[PDB]
C-alpha cells in the first residue's frame, strides 16, 4: 500500500494509471487482507478504457500529486477494469443501484475490510470533502457502517446469488417477449427507438429467433432494417472496416469511434444469417471488410485478437476517422469528385463542421463501389494510416476471442472463405495455449496471465470449438469442447448444479453471482445454456441432457424474478427447448448435401458429418 503495483497487469486500462502518484493496487487477496491489518477502508474505482470520463477523473484528480497523498494515507485504493474483472463490476454496479443511486462508469466505492460496500457514486467532483468525511465516518461511526453495509449486502445476495423455484420452459413466454421487443423497433431508422442507439445483440437474437421458430415476418423485417441501416451509417467505418460501439443520434450518424471486438463479432454472425434470407450483397461486403480489418488491426503477433482500439487520437474524439473536404481533394486529385459523391461529403460537414463518411443517403442502391472510387477509397486508407493512429488494447480476452473465433468459423463456412478459417484456428490455438492444469485464463497481455477464468470464458470456447467442427469436420474440436466442459464444471458448478460467474475457489469475491444479466453480450448463464445445448447435439450425452433440463428450469426461475437483462436467458431456453440437429453422410466436402447445409446458416442447428 506504499507503491503503485498497477504495472505489469494484463489490463492496458490499468497500465495507464500506473504512473499515478496514488499507490494503486490490483483487486486480490493481498489487497483486502492489508485493509484488515491496517483497519483502513478500501476505495474501489471501476472503469473501462473506452470511457472519456475515466480519463477526465484521472487528470483532474488521480494524476494530481496532492490529492493522491490524501488517498495514500486514508485508504488502500484499488483500480479495476470493467473488462478484466467483470465479476467485480457487476457486484458493485448492482450495489450502487441498491443504495438508491443509479450510476455508470467511472464508479467510486467505499469498502470495509471484508469488502462489503457502504457508500458509492459515479463521478466525484466535494470529492476531497468526502475523501476525508468517510475517514471521519470510518472512525466516528463504526456502528453506522456495519448497519448500512450488511443491509445493502443482503439485498445483493438475494438479487444476484439467490436461486429460485424451478420454472417450466414454455413457448408462450418467448413469443410474448418477441412481441414487446418488436414494438420497440424504430419503424424507419431501425433499432430500439430510444436514443442513444445501441446494436443490442440480445434484442436482435429474439427477433431472429422469432422469425425462425414462428415465421413472423414482421420481426424478421425489424431485424433486417435495424442491421442493414446500422451497417450503412456513420457508426460503421466505410474506409477500413469495423463497427463502432454505439450511435449518438437515432439516425445511426454520429457515433462513438471506439471499436469493440464483441460488437464486430456479433454482427458478423447476424449479417451471415441475414445474407442467407435476403441475398443482399451488402451483408457480405460488410463481413468481408470487417474481417480484413480484424486481421489487419486487431490480430496480435500470436494470432489472438486484441480487445479494442481507442476512440480518441492525439487528444480529440475521432480525429483519426473524420475528414474535411480540403484534405481528401489534395490526396485523391482528379478522382476526388466521385469519392465525395459516395460518402455524403459536404463543405459544411455533418459533425462539428467535419465530414464523417456514411452511405445513409443511398442506402437502398448498389453497395459495391465503382472501380475508380474503390481505388480512391483504398488510396485514402494508405494516407489515413500515416495519421497519429489511436492506441490499442492488446489485452486478449478469452470470452471475447471465442465470440470472434465463432464468427470467423461460421461465416467462413457459409462463404467458403478458407482464409477466414485459418485465422480462426490461429486465434483458437493461441487462446487455447493458456489451458494448463485443467483450467484456462481470462485475459492475457505481454506474457502476463489472469487466473482463474470466468464462466463466460469456457462457454465461449465451447461454442467456438463446436463451430470449428461444423466448418472442418474434425472431431478433435468436439473433444476440446468436452475438455472445456469438464473445466467449467470443476470450477463453476455449485452443489445445486447451477453455474456461477466467478470460480467457487476464488477467495477475493464477495458474492458468487450466477451471471444472469445481459449487456452487449448475452449473460453468462445465457451463453452456458446454448453451449451445453449445442454440446449435447454434438455428443448425445444423456446425462448432459438430463442435467440441462434442470439447468434450464433453474435459470428460468430466476429470470422471472429479474427486472431487466434476462433476454439472453429466454432466447437460450427457447433454443434449448427445441434444438435442431442434422447429420450428413457424404464422401467428400464437394457433396451437394454438405453444400446446401453450409449455405444455410442457422443458429438453432448443429451440423454433424460422417464419412461414407
Amino acid at each position: 500500500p506504499d507503491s503503485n503495483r498497477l504495472a505489469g497487469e494484463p489490463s492496458a486500462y490499468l497500465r495507464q494509471h500506473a504512473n499515478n502518484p496514488v499507490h494503486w493496487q490490483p483487486w486480490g487477496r493481498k489487497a483486502l487482507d492489508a485493509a484488515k491489518e491496517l483497519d483502513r477502508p478500501i476505495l474501489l474505482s471501476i472503469g473501462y478504457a473506452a470511457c472519456h470520463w475515466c480519463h477526465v477523473m484521472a487528470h483532474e484528480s488521480f494524476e494530481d500529486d496532492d490529492v493522491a497523498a490524501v488517498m495514500n494515507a486514508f485508504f488502500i485504493n484499488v483500480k479495476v477494469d470493467r473488462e478484466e474483472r467483470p465479476d467485480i463490476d457487476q457486484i458493485y454496479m448492482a450495489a450502487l443501484g441498491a443504495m438508491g443511486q443509479q450510476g455508470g462508469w467511472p464508479l467510486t466505492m467505499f469498502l470495509r475490510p471484508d469488502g462489503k460496500p457502504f457508500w458509492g457514486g459515479t463521478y466525484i467532483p466535494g470529492f476531497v470533502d468526502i475523501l476525508h468525511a468517510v475517514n471521519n465516518l470510518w472512525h466516528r461511526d463504526k456502528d453506522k457502517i456495519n448497519h448500512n453495509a450488511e443491509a445493502v449486502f443482503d439485498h445483493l445476495e438475494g438479487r444476484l446469488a439467490a436461486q429460485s423455484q424451478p420454472l417450466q420452459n414454455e413457448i408462450s413466454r418467448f413469443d410474448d417477449l418477441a412481441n414487446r421487443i418488436g414494438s420497440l423497433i424504430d419503424p424507419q431508422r431501425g433499432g430500439i427507438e430510444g436514443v442513444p442507439k445501441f446494436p443490442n445483440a440480445p434484442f436482435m437474437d429474439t427477433l431472429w429467433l422469432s422469425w425462425l421458430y414462428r415465421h413472423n415476418e414482421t420481426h424478421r423485417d425489424n431485424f433486417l432494417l435495424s442491421l442493414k441501416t446500422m451497417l450503412q451509417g456513420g457508426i460503421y467505418d466505410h474506409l477500413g472496416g469495423g463497427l463502432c460501439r454505439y450511435s449518438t443520434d437515432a439516425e445511426w450518424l454520429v457515433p462513438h469511434f471506439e471499436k469493440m471486438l464483441y460488437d464486430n463479432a456479433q454482427f458478423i454472425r447476424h449479417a451471415n444469417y441475414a445474407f442467407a434470407e435476403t441475398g443482399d450483397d451488402l451483408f457480405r461486403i460488410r463481413i468481408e471488410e470487417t474481417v480484413d480489418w480484424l486481421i489487419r488491426e486487431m490480430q496480435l503477433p500470436d494470432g489472438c485478437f486484441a480487445s479494442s482500439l481507442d476512440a480518441d487520437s492525439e487528444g480529440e474524439e475521432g480525429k483519426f476517422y473524420v475528414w474535411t473536404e480540403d484534405e481528401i481533394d489534395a490526396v485523391l486529385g482528379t478522382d476526388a469528385e466521385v469519392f465525395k459523391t459516395f460518402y455524403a461529403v459536404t463543405p459544411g460537414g455533418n459533425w462539428e463542421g467535419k465530414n464523417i463518411l456514411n452511405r445513409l443517403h443511398a442506402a437502398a442502391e448498389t453497395p459495391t463501389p465503382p472501380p475508380l472510387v474503390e481505388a480512391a477509397r483504398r488510396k485514402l486508407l494508405a494516407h489515413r494510416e500515416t495519421r497519429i493512429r489511436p492506441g490499442r488494447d492488446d489485452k486478449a480476452l478469452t470470452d471475447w476471442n471465442g465470440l470472434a473465433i465463432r464468427a470467423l468459423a461460421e461465416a467462413g463456412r457459409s462463404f467458403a472463405r478458407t482464409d477466414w478459417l485459418e485465422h480462426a484456428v490461429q486465434a483458437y490455438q493461441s487462446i487455447g495455449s493458456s489451458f494448463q492444469d485443467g483450467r484456462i485464463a481470462h485475459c492475457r497481455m505481454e506474457g502476463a496471465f489472469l487466473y482463474p477464468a470466468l464462466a463466460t470464458d469456457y462457454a465461449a470456447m465451447i461454442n467456438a470449438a463446436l463451430a470449428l467442427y461444423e466448418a472442418t469436420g474434425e472431431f478433435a474440436y468436439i473433444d476440446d469442447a468436452r475438455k472445456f466442459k469438464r473445466a467449467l464444471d470443476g470450477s463453476h458448478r455449485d452443489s445445486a448444479g447451477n453455474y456461477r460467474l466467478s470460480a467457487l475457489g476464488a477467495d477475493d469475491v464477495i458474492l458468487h453471482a450466477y451471471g444472469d444479466y445481459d449487456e452487449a453480450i448475452p449473460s453468462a448463464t445465457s451463453q452456458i445454456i446454448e453451449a451445453l445445448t449445442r454440446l449435447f447435439l454434438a455428443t448425445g450425452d444423456s446425462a448432459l441432457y438430463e442435467e440441462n433440463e434442470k439447468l434450464i428450469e433453474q435459470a428460468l426461475g430466476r429470470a422471472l424474478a429479474q427486472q431487466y437483462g434476462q433476454i439472453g436467458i429466454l432466447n437460450a431456453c427457447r433454443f434449448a427447448g427445441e434444438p435442431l440437429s442434422l447429420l450428413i453422410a457424404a464422401t467428400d466436402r464437394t457433396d451437394e448435401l454438405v453444400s446446401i447445409a453450409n449455405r444455410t446458416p442457422d443458429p438453432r442447428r448443429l451440423d454433424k458429418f460422417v464419412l461414407v
Copy 2:
C-alpha cells in the same frame, strides 16, 4: 450328517467328491445347525473344478480313508464350489486377508458353529493330519481364544465387505489417475500387466479402452492393443480349435494354464470387437469368429445355454490334449507338415517339457490370415486332435456367465452381420431365462438341479444381455425384460439405504451381506449394476431411473475409495455413468445405412434406440427437438426441412 450329500448339487466339482469317504455337506442352514448341536468346528473347503491343486489335496487327503475317519469324527465337513457360491467365497477369502495369509484355492478354513472363522490356511498337505488334531485341541481346551479372534476377524470383514461410509461426488479427474497408473504397469514390449503370471485382466483393459474413448489417449489405446494382440498370438490361445485359456505362466504368453473359462472368452470377444472397429486388423476378426465357433461347437449345451468351463487335465496330464510332438505332426500332415511347423514354431526339442505348444509369438506382426495350404493342415490337425481323449467339461450353467456370453454374441453378431450368432445368443437367453419364475431367477442349474436364490450379478448380467439383444434386433420386448430383471433385483437385493447386496436379503446361510464391491476376473457386482442401470436409462430415457442411479453412484464411490484394491470396475462404471451416449436412429427401413454405420461402430459407452417412421448413398438425418424424421437422399428434399 453322517454321509456324503454332495451328489445332486448343481456343480461338477462337488460331484467329483460325492464318492469321497469324507461325509461332505453342501453349504446351507442344515450344516450350520448340525455344527451347533454337536459342538464341532466346521471344516470348510472351497475350490473350483479347473483348479489343479484342488484335486491334489483330494487325492492326497480327501480320498484317504485314514484321514477321512478323523474328519468325520471331530469335524463337520462342508465343501463349497467357488463358482456356485461366490458370495461364500468372498466372505472367507477376506478372512485370510484379515489373518495375514496371502490366500488362494484350495481354501481350507475352520469355522465355529455360527459361521465365523478363527483359523485358516491355503493348502495344507500331509502336516494335514497334524493340523487337524492341533485345531481339535483348541475347541475343547480354550474356546475363549477362538471366540476372541473369530470376532476380531468378523469385525474386519464387515468393515471392508459391508461397511458404508458417506456418499462421494462423481469425479472424472479420479478416473484419469487410475488410467494413468494402470498404463504405467503395462509391459511395453510383451504387453499386459508386467509380472508373472500374466492374466487377461479384463477390468484393467476396460480402463485402458475407456481412457482412449473419453480422452483420446493414444498411449492407453496402444497398451490395450499390444496386450490384446500379443495374448491372442501367444500359446495361451488355442490356434487349432479357438478359445482362450485363463492365464499364462510366463511373461511371453507362451506356457498357459490349459483350462478354458466361459467368462474369459466372453470378455475378450467384446474387447476384440472394439479393437477391430478401430484398427481394422484382421487378427481381431479372425480370433472372434474362431472362438465363437469354439463356443457353439464345444461349450453350448443341447438345451441352449453354455457350459461353465473346460478342464486342463486330460488323461491325468496337464494340457495333454492341446500339446503336440513333432513326430506326430509329421505323421498326420505328411509332406506338407513343414509348411505348418514353421507357421506355429514347431521345433523338435519343443518349447515346454520336450513338446510343442502351438503359438504365433515368433511373428505376431505378420499377416494373420494363414495361407490356404496351412489352414488346410490346420483344419486337419484339429480333427485329428478330436480323436484324442477329450478333457472333461463342467456342464454347470451359471446365469451371470451366460449373460456375459449372450452380450458378446449379440454385439459381435451385430457388428459382423452374423445372424447365426444372434440366434445362438437368443437360444442361451431364452434357456437361461426359463428359470425366471415367480420373479426369481436361478444362479445356476445342471441336469435339472437348480440353485436358489440368485445373486446380484445374475440380474445385472441379464439386464446387459437383454439390452444387448435389443440393439441387435430392435424388439421392445427385450427392454421390458430388462425392466423385469431390474425390479426382481430391487425386490430381493436393494436395502433400505438404496444399495444392492450380492446375496439376497432373504438368504439365511450368509454370515454377512456384502455389497459385492470387489472385482475379480469379472467386474464386481456393484460395477455391473451401475453399468446395467445406466444402459437401462439409455434405452428407456426414464428420469426417475437417472435420479436414483446418481445417488447409487455416489454411495458406491464412497465405499470404493475406502477399499484398497478391486475397485477398478466401479470406477469404470461410474466414468461411463457420468458420460453415457445414446444414438437415436430414425429409419424408414432397417436397411437404412445409419443402422449400418452404428453396427460397424461399436462403443461400450453407447446404446442405440430405433424408431421406425445397400451401397453407400449420401443421405441426411434431420431432427427438430424430440421429432426425428426418416432420412433424405436428394438435394431438394433437404432444402424443404432446413
